[PDB]
């Protein structure tokens, strides 16, 4: 069906450049407006740029004029955001989204109808930082000995000393999803991130049932599997 | 430029309540107003377009109305899965700047729930690297406010801890908290009892979970 897949985000030093791409699948790309909308961590939505892909007409937010260039290839049904002179305040998740044409229509006896962003991509994270890429270390949070065997236990994994975000954590290669809490990372005094991923399991299962957290940090190409024993 | 002033910045309501979110445009935006719902870590989802039209597939409890420059998103029957940040957005300038509005965080109000408290010593693996992380977990509590105090051989700690809270659970409306105490391997081995003491409205008395290093 309709899909927007974004690519090209990552870690970049201040003043550098990045190029985001957004590949559109299940709709007429010639008959759309494409927008880039960004969200800095924990902040609101900020429109960045718009393009009409066929006529190539563009619009930019004042925050990015002269630094960013939105473009589109109607052959590849792919829109692009070329970002130059990146600053720390450009750090955000960058979203691709779509207006179906027309922007506004008028129908007699029914009035005006304005298009809205009905399809958004999943977003791509852009981090503007001088800090260096580092893969994580994974440690078990072992379920406690201070314990009965008749109730609920908690176990988990500590994913520390990595940069940049994000980290994905699954349990038992995805087979265990209920009772999982993967916490927001906090930035340690090292300048690196650290988070915990915990699960509550039946206390009777421990030691028999195998519990592995699967940590993936794609920025560093790092995949670690940590088995968590008591 | 054209500003969307979105009032309340946040609100808390019970399941089934009627909730209204407001957006005032600094000047005329006609009916070029959309309403989006954003859950944590996900792209915004369109709820309302052209200020009053329900987007296809959206539950009927979401509706939008316009009076002049005032735009209202109404959630007539609040559901637990409606925990989210909502944003208005204007598009009255054809291929011109689109502006949003600061958002409204909607928390779901539920009965008081006490946290389940667990403590985790550092792995031998991490100690072999030279640092020690002691983790305290607070599971599935509600209200979100909670206090964690670390005590090492009964000495209160300060400055060596970092916290993180999950987003409100979309299904049971609870929170969870992770507190991490960081010590050097040497300072860690120079002490015995590591305790996490938790204060929360759902607990008659503060609850301590402890372990001994040996």
């Amino acid at each position: 069906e309709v899909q927007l897949v974004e690519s090209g985000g990552g870690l970049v030093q201040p003043g550098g450049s990045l190029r985001l791409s957004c590949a559109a699948s299940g709709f007429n790309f010639y008959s759309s407006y494409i927008h880039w909308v960004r969200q800095a961590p924990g902040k609101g939505l900020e429109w960045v740029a718009s393009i009409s892909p066929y006529s190539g007409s563009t619009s930019y937010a004042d925050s990015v004029k002269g630094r960013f260039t939105i473009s589109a290839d109607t052959s590849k049904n792919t829109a692009y955001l070329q970002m130059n002179s990146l600053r720390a305040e450009d750090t955000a998740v960058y979203y691709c989204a779509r207006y179906s044409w027309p922007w506004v229509s008028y129908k007699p006896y029914y009035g005006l109808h304005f298009s809205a962003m009905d399809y958004w991509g999943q977003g791509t994270l852009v981090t503007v930082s001088s800090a260096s890429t580092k893969g994580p270390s994974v440690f078990p949070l072992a379920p406690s000995s201070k314990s009965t065997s008749g109730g609920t236990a908690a176990l988990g994994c500590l994913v520390k000393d990595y940069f940049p975000e994000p980290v994905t954590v699954s349990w038992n290669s995805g087979a265990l999803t209920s009772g999982v809490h993967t916490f927001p990372a906090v930035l340690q005094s090292s300048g690196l991130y650290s988070l915990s991923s915990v699960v509550t399991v039946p206390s009777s299962s421990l030691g028999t049932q195998t519990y592995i957290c699967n940590v993936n940090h794609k920025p560093s190409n790092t995949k670690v599997d940590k088995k968590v024993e008591p | 430029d054209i500003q969307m002033t979105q009032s309340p910045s946040s609100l808390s309501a019970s399941v089934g309540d009627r909730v209204t979110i407001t957006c005032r445009a600094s000047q005329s935006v006609s009916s070029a107003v959309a309403w989006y719902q954003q859950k944590p870590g996900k792209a915004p989802k369109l709820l309302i377009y052209s200020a009053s039209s329900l987007y296809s597939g959206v539950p009927s409890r979401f509706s939008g109305s316009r009076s002049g420059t005032d735009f209202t998103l109404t959630i007539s029957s609040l559901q637990p899965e409606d925990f989210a940040t909502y944003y208005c957005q204007q598009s009255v300038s054809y291929m011109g700047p689109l502006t949003f509005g600061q958002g409204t965080k909607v928390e779901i109000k539920r009965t008081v729930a006490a946290p389940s408290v667990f403590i985790f010593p550092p792995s031998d693996s991490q100690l072999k690297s030279g640092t020690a992380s002691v983790v305290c977990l607070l599971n599935n509590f509600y209200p979100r406010e909670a206090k964690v105090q670390w005590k090492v051989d009964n000495a209160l700690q300060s400055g060596n801890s970092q916290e993180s809270v999950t987003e409100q659970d979309s299904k049971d409306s609870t929170y969870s908290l992770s507190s991490t105490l960081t010590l050097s391997k040497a300072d860690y081995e120079k002490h015995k009892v590591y305790a996490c003491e938790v204060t929360h409205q759902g607990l008659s008395s503060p609850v301590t979970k402890s372990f001994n290093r040996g």
């Binding site: 044409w101 027309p102 506004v104 008028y106 009035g111 005006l112 | 006609s30 054809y94």
Partner: peptide, 23 residues
């Protein structure tokens, strides 16, 4: 009918004046 081609050649003020005529 589509209004985009019309609005593309109107000022912001002209655009809103047209849109308000069509309400």
């Amino acid at each position: 009918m589509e209004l985009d081609a019309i609005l593309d050649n109107l000022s912001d003020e002209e655009q809103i004046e047209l849109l308000e005529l069509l309400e």
